[PDB]
Amino acid sequence: SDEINELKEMVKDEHIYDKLVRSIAPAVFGHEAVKKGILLQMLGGVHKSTVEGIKLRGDINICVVGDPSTSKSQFLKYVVGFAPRSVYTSGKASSAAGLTAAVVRDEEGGDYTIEAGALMLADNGICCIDEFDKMDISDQVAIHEAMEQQTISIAKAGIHATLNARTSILAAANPVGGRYNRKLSLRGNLNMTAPIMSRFDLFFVILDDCNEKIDTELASHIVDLHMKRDEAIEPPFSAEQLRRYIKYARTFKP
Amino acid sequence: RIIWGTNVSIQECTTNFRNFLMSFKYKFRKILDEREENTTDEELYYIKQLNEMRELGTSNLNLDARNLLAYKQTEDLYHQLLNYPQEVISIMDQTIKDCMVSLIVDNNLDYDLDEIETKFYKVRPYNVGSCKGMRELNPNDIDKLINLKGLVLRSTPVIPDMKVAFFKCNVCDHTMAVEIDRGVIQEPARCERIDCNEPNSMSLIHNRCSFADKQVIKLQETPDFVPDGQTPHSISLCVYDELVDSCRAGDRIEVTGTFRSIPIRANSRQRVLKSLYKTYVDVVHVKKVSDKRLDVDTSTIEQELMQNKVDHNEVEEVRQITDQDLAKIREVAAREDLYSLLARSIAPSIYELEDVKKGILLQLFGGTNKTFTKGGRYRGDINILLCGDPSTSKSQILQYVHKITPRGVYTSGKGSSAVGLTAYITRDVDTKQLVLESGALVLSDGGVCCIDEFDKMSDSTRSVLHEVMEQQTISIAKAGIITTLNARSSILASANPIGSRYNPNLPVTENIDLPPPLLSRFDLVYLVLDKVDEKNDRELAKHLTNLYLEDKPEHISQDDVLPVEFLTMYISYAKEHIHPIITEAAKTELVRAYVGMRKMGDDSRSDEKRITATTRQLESMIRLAEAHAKMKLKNVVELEDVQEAVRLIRSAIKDYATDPKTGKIDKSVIQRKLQEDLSREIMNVLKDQASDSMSFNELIKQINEHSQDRVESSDIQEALSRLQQEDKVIVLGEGVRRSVR
Amino acid sequence: FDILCVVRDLVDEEADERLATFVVDSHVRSHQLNARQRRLQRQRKKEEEISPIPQELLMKYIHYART
Amino acid sequence: NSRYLANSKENFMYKEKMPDSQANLMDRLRERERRSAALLSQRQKRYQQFLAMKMTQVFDILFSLTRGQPYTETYLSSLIVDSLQDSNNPIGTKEASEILAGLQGILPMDISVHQVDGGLKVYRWNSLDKNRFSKLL
Ligand SMILES: Nc1ncnc2c1ncn2[C@@H]1O[C@H](COP(=O)(O)OP(=O)(O)OP(O)(O)=S)[C@@H](O)[C@H]1O
Ligand SMILES: Nc1ncnc2c1ncn2[C@@H]1O[C@H](COP(=O)(O)OP(=O)(O)OP(O)(O)=S)[C@@H](O)[C@H]1O
């Protein structure tokens, strides 16, 4: 009954949805668009199956794509340290086989078996990724089934199996030319095929442009960070009570 | 009693050692060290540690051998330690338990005099004199106390070891337990207490039997001296029950332990052994990580030893400090040409291109570790590409630095792969574990690296940089394993502009090949351009011919004293005794500097061809200004210490507004007008200032400070010089400046 | 192959509206002994919201046919 | 109803249009700051409440399994977090430190905590009975 009071507070307050969203990236400056996109990530859908016919996905896959110095890797190397059971992979260093599932031999029975991989051991948690563009298609392919069909299926070395990977994913690839010509359009500017461009049920092409009433604030912010003493960064909700509040809210299936 | 095997008699050793443990004070250490004096007026250090342990039950007493050395009448023991560890340690533990007993019969209640005496006591003597790494290890010192450094490669999983048997309760129904005290395990033929089965098959219950932790830790020493040809060596290690798991993979530990030597078998069927014993190190103490991350712990009590270790930081980490050395240091810091001087003092053989030297120096002192509880991993150090016309000392500067730093790892480009750049993991099927191998970048954990032909590097490579440079981690994810190995390291890459020189008809960020992300990644880019001066050319030619004049040439440049060796210890003191705190005033001028950098970079056609000033410019400015303040031993960043940081970042970029291709073939009309208007205003002032005399400085504060930023004021010198030729004013002594009648 | 199912996505002001209504109603219908009766029969009422043959009938049907 | 913390009505619309009061709102606000004193402190007591319930199990967390006497603070904390507190009811590290401090303070008889250089090492367990003092919330 005690902790019920704590939730009762953090849920009966009026502006929680705002109090939350501006309190997901205490270090990062602003980006109230993306921070929203993340807060919704950790709070999945319902994944409730249809009539016995088929089952449909119930998870969200935000996929940032930003110009240089947009603090897009900070969101990841934060989430993967705050979202439960998560994993951070640079992608281009990794391979597609490693990402979905591995087949390997064991001496116990002299038989082939499964290596969980990032996707299967990332079940019911966000599996963030970096630099899609750098990941050659040979590994971009191995994800699709963990996007919409929600489950991986593998037929190798005699073993046929299928493992369900209910895993939110993410991304942080950079545009084609590192930074992307405002001149050019967006079509011939992302360098990624149609499907994997669609399966991402968010999209955030983050820009980076000049200003004064912005860049001054940003610089003051970064400085205050590097001025440890000026860690006034305390947001309303700590990075802990947010966890318990989620672990509650994960259960409503409206 | 004399020992048959060491002839080191016990009674004298224990007797001297006892009052040694009672006469001990901090001062002995101070006198040898020669450092400035209190330690709360030098309380008894050993009873301090001993009381603390007794109250904490650690039963492990860390100890620096040099302490025991620095006390009178103990050097005998200090050397016998290095010579008879197997027994001096034993007599040490005996004395430890006995002084515990005397302390508690003096100190009313602790462990009821028995719980203390029951449990054993072990000692941890560390820092006995750093041996010369692997290649010096002599078969003459098979049983001595070696000190070793270097990261660890692989740690065998915790391996149990028999200590006391627990033999099967027979039909006789009274199980029997017995220790071993040697590699032998004896099972009594007869059954239990009653000889119900004199003929008996006693068995053993290998689940209730006690055990002991024996962890095997391979080790790859640091490449401090590995000449060439051979990969740095490796010395397997064993650890016994308390330091176990104090060293995960990847760590950069230091160890102090006894050497050992054991034969091997070939057939393993017959009892016959093989000559040419194998060797390992039975560790005794482990200096934890030689790092300051302190994110979370690794093991048991051992962390208490770590806390007892970290506080003595000063002498133990400097490994040498004297206020004659420290006095020399502060004196050098006082010298005005320091930033210039030390620059050339890095690479004296290197000619006038000083700003490169300046940036390099600032790399050496790189930044300070600002560790946040939220966020974190803000790349405490910096990274410097440098490019320019072929044959312009770049590669040799790299050699020079790599030789300077005590941790450098030279490396070429296009003769290396992603695995070479960032260690590669292996799921060892022997014990089914994670081993890491040969991270060139990981060897450079702390201290700089170097990389050549950075352009000629493959696109398949030059991608791990995209990660390590900005997070200092490598997230590997392959068939067997996913992991993230952190490799904090300040890369320092050479380059070569495309083709074989500039094309001052080509944009600059196209003349360099690297994509803008990776480029902005680089904290600071140099453009070492070769000129047709003919003014420096003959100076350079002399600067080479002179070194060719002698046989063993030294001090190739101007003969100004510079401390080729002193500066290294200077650096290794600076990076560890001072932490710059960025004062408020610095924040303002830093913000305005960034804003001005970026607004200048603004353009519509700057999108494809120019290098844009981005947040990493601010990261550069701050991590670099704090390094400058670390230099000169400044404890807090000033305001007039980010200005040269801005200057350095502008080394690359000074001369283009909308389109690149600097060009800039260096008295202008607008300079004419500047001098002219200054003349007008200053004449009007000095004729309005009836007290016709005032100093140049007073005049500057009268005019050049009324409003926005001060001017060169040597252009003011030319103005007043004109007014001397024209004779509109008269300096009339340096102290003042009068006008003409 | 013999049959080539060529599908294509095309923007339409109306057909997509009806399709959307359909999909939304789909995500709506997705989500003791007498409770199990009231549950089985309600699942079958949803089986009838898609008016033609219920599924189990159709799988028994395909088995019967291919046999 | 049972504490199903839903709010399906409060999100209806900008219904808050009936009260067409005068500057009387300042009146309400004139008292607002007053309650801000209590409210804040109230929230504070909530932790004095919240942490309370947590420690009701902690003297059976370290107790029922860990009989190593020299246990430190960082190790014990990092044990508390990632213990059953990875289930429905999580907790943060420094919060675990607070739990430890509270346990010691509400039972200084056995639990003796004294800090050396960094991290407060904790006592040697001797297994009392607890709720008899837990009633002192
Ligand atoms: N909006 C921001 N506010 C504060 N700091 C920022 C911001 N954006 C970037 N930074 C800082 O600048 C550095 C660069 O951030 P990022 O651009 O996210 O690096 P990154 O994730 O490697 O980007 P890429 O595309 O992979 S090269 C980070 O270490 C941040 O601390
Ligand atoms: N200003 C200078 N000071 C000292 N040595 C110089 C200078 N200019 C040229 N040299 C010498 O000229 C040679 C040039 O070597 P480097 O410039 O280091 O090689 P490199 O420039 O990397 O060649 P590339 O084409 O750039 S890969 C060396 O022998 C240098 O010692």
Instruction: State how far the Cα of A101 lies from the Cα of B478, in Å rounded to an integer.
Output: 10
Q: Which residues of A touch B591 (CB under 8 A)?
A: 216, 219-220, 223
- Based on C-alpha coordinates, what's the Rg of chain A? 20
Cα→Cα distances B254→B153, B257, B283, B551, D81, Å: 13, 10, 10, 41, 31
- Please tell me the total number of residues recorded for chain D in this structure: 137
Q: What share of chain C is helix, strand, coil (3-state, %, to 5)?
A: 65, 0, 35
Backbone φ and ψ of B724, nearest 5°: -85, -45
Query: Which residue's CA is the nearest one to ligand 1's atom 21?
Result: A73
Quick count: other Cβ atoms within 10 Å of Cβ A13? 14
SS3 label, residue A204? strand
* Residues A243, A245, A247: CA angle, nearest 5 degrees: 70
Instruction: State how far the Cα of B246 lies from the Cα of B243, in Å rounded to an integer.
Output: 5
Query: What residue ranges do the domains of chain A occupy?
Result: 1-254
Instruction: State how far the Cα of B566 lies from the Cα of B325, in Å rounded to an integer.
Output: 9
Q: Which residues of B touch A227 (CB under 8 A)?
A: 581-582, 587
Q: Which residues of C touch A56 (CB under 8 A)?
A: 27, 30
In this structure, what token pair is assigned to residue B45?
Answer: 């250090």
Method used to obtain the model: cryo-EM
**Contact criterion met (CB < 8 Å) for C46 and A56:** no
Instruction: State how far the Cα of B741 lies from the Cα of C11, in Å rounded to an integer.
Output: 90
To the nearest whole Å, the CA of B246 is away from the closest chain D CA by 13
To the nearest whole Å, the CA of B735 is away from the closest chain A CA by 42
Mutation probe of ligand 1 site: the residue of A31, A32, A69, A226 with most atoms within 8 A of C-beta? A69
Pairing of strands B492-493, B384-388: parallel
Cα→Cα distances B28→B22, B43, B68, B71, D37, Å: 13, 12, 9, 6, 58
Instruction: State how far the Cα of B576 lies from the Cα of B564, in Å rounded to an integer.
Output: 20
Per-residue exposure over B544-572, b if at least 16 CB sit within 10 Å of its own CB, e if not: eeeeeeeeeeeebbeeeebeeeebebbbb
In this structure, what token pair is assigned to residue A2?
Answer: 């005690």
Cα→Cα distances B587→A220, B385, B523, Å: 8, 27, 19
| 8 A C-beta contact, residue A94 and residue B477 | yes
Backbone φ and ψ of B528, nearest 5°: -85, 90
CA dihedral B126, B131, B137, B142 (to 10 degrees): -40
Nearest residue to D4 (alpha-carbon basis) of A17, A18, A251:
A251
Give how far the C-alpha of residue A192 lies from the chain's centroid of Cα atoms, to the nearest Å: 18
* Residues B415, B416, B418: CA angle, nearest 5 degrees: 155
For helices B75-83 and B10-23, angle between their N-to-C axes, nearest 10 degrees: 120
| 8 A C-beta contact, residue B471 and residue B445 | no
Please work out whether the CB of residue B391 comes within 6 Å of at least one atom of ligand 2: yes
Nearest chain D residue (CA) to A84:
D86
Write the burial class of residue B282 (CB in 10 Å: 0-12 exposed, 13-18 middle, 19+ buried).
middle
Instruction: State how far the Cα of B460 lies from the Cα of A95, in Å rounded to an integer.
Output: 13
**Contact criterion met (CB < 8 Å) for C55 and A51:** yes
SS3 label, residue B125? strand
Write the burial class of residue B18 (CB in 10 Å: 0-12 exposed, 13-18 middle, 19+ buried).
middle
| 8 A C-beta contact, residue B721 and residue B704 | no
Pairing of strands B384-388, B274-287: unpaired
Place of tokens 């003796």: D112
| 8 A C-beta contact, residue A74 and residue A25 | yes
| 8 A C-beta contact, residue B589 and residue B633 | no
CB neighbours of B410 closer than 8 A, spacing ≥ 6?
B398, B399, B402, B450
Cα→Cα distances B105→B50, B60, B519, B695, Å: 14, 21, 70, 80
Please work out whether the CB of residue A222 comes within 6 Å of at least one atom of ligand 1: yes
| 8 A C-beta contact, residue B234 and residue B153 | yes
Nearest residue to B92 (alpha-carbon basis) of B236, B281, B285:
B285
Instruction: State how far the Cα of B71 lies from the Cα of B24, in Å rounded to an integer.
Output: 7
Q: Which CATH superfamily is domain A1-254 in?
A: P-loop containing nucleotide triphosphate hydrolases (3.40.50.300)
Quick count: other Cβ atoms within 10 Å of Cβ B584? 10
The sign of the CA dihedral A8, A13, A15, A18 is negative
| 8 A C-beta contact, residue B65 and residue B20 | no
| 8 A C-beta contact, residue D61 and residue D80 | yes
Please work out whether the CB of residue B392 comes within 6 Å of at least one atom of ligand 2: yes
The sign of the CA dihedral A151, A154, A159, A160 is positive
Backbone φ and ψ of B561, nearest 5°: -60, 135
Instruction: State how far the Cα of D23 lies from the Cα of D9, in Å rounded to an integer.
Output: 28
Instruction: State how far the Cα of B475 lies from the Cα of A90, in Å rounded to an integer.
Output: 5
To the nearest whole Å, the CA of A43 is away from the closest chain D CA by 15
For helices B85-106 and B45-56, angle between their N-to-C axes, nearest 10 degrees: 80
SS3 label, residue A248? helix
Instruction: State how far the Cα of B330 lies from the Cα of B563, in Å rounded to an integer.
Output: 14
HSE, CB side, 13 Å, CA atoms: give it for residue B402: 22
Instruction: State how far the Cα of B362 lies from the Cα of A173, in Å rounded to an integer.
Output: 32
CB neighbours of B378 closer than 8 A, spacing ≥ 6?
A225, A226, B370, B372, B619
Quick count: other Cβ atoms within 10 Å of Cβ A177? 15
In this structure, what token pair is assigned to residue B300?
Answer: 């048991």
| 8 A C-beta contact, residue B85 and residue B122 | no
List B274's β-bridge partners, or say none. Answer: B264
Place of tokens 């960094």: D118
In this structure, what token pair is assigned to residue D12?
Answer: 């209806």
Please work out whether the CB of residue A92 comes within 6 Å of at least one atom of ligand 1: no
Query: B297-301, long-range: CB within 8 Å, 24+ apart, which pairs?
Result: B297/D72, B297/D74, B297/D75, B297/D78, B298/B245, B298/B246, B298/B247, B298/B248, B299/B243, B299/B244, B299/B245, B299/B246, B300/B242, B300/D68, B300/D75, B301/B58, B301/B60, B301/B242, B301/D70, B301/D72
Nearest residue to B511 (alpha-carbon basis) of B523, B498, B524, B500:
B498
| Amino acid in the structure at residue B656 | Y
Instruction: State how far the Cα of A113 lies from the Cα of C2, in Å rounded to an integer.
Output: 37
For helices B354-364 and B615-630, angle between their N-to-C axes, nearest 10 degrees: 80
Please work out whether the CB of residue B529 comes within 6 Å of at least one atom of ligand 2: no
Pairing of strands B176-179, B164-167: antiparallel
Q: What share of chain D is helix, strand, coil (3-state, %, to 5)?
A: 45, 5, 50
| 8 A C-beta contact, residue B498 and residue B508 | no
List A163's β-bridge partners, or say none. Answer: A152
The sign of the CA dihedral D18, D20, D24, D30 is positive
* Residues B203, B206, B212: CA angle, nearest 5 degrees: 135
**Contact criterion met (CB < 8 Å) for A94 and B476:** yes
Quick count: other Cβ atoms within 10 Å of Cβ B361? 22
Nearest residue to A172 (alpha-carbon basis) of A65, A52, A99, A30:
A65
Provide the annotated binding site of B for ATP. 388-395
Instruction: State how far the Cα of B530 lies from the Cα of B544, in Å rounded to an integer.
Output: 17
CB neighbours of C5 closer than 8 A, spacing ≥ 6?
none
For helices A32-41 and A72-79, angle between their N-to-C axes, nearest 10 degrees: 30
List B215's β-bridge partners, or say none. Answer: B239
Cα→Cα distances B555→B289, B544, B559, Å: 38, 12, 7
Instruction: State how far the Cα of A152 lies from the Cα of A122, in Å rounded to an integer.
Output: 13
**Contact criterion met (CB < 8 Å) for D90 and A247:** yes
| Amino acid in the structure at residue B436 | L
Cα→Cα distances D79→D57, D71, D96, Å: 14, 11, 9
Instruction: State how far the Cα of B572 lies from the Cα of B317, in Å rounded to an integer.
Output: 9
For helices B615-630 and B584-601, angle between their N-to-C axes, nearest 10 degrees: 140
Query: Which residue's CA is the nearest one to ligand 2's atom 16?
Result: B393
In this structure, what token pair is assigned to residue D39?
Answer: 């409210």
| 8 A C-beta contact, residue B495 and residue B387 | yes
Instruction: State how far the Cα of B368 lies from the Cα of B488, in Å rounded to an integer.
Output: 12
Compute the distance from residue A74 Cα to the ligand 1 centre, in Å.
6
Ligand nearest to the CA of A171: 1
**Contact criterion met (CB < 8 Å) for B581 and A229:** yes
- Based on C-alpha coordinates, what's the Rg of chain B? 34
SS3 label, residue B521? helix
A54 vs C: CB within 8 A: no
To the nearest whole Å, the CA of D118 is away from the closest chain B CA by 7
Element (H, E) at B258: strand B254-264
For chain A, strand residue ranges (E) read 64-66, 87-89, 102-106, 111-115, 126-129, 151-156, 159-164, 168-169, 204-206
Instruction: State how far the Cα of B251 lies from the Cα of B152, in Å rounded to an integer.
Output: 6
Mutate to test the interface with A, among C8, C23, C29, C31 (most CBs of A within 10 A): C31
Nearest residue to B133 (alpha-carbon basis) of B232, B66, B278, B258:
B232
| Amino acid in the structure at residue B167 | F
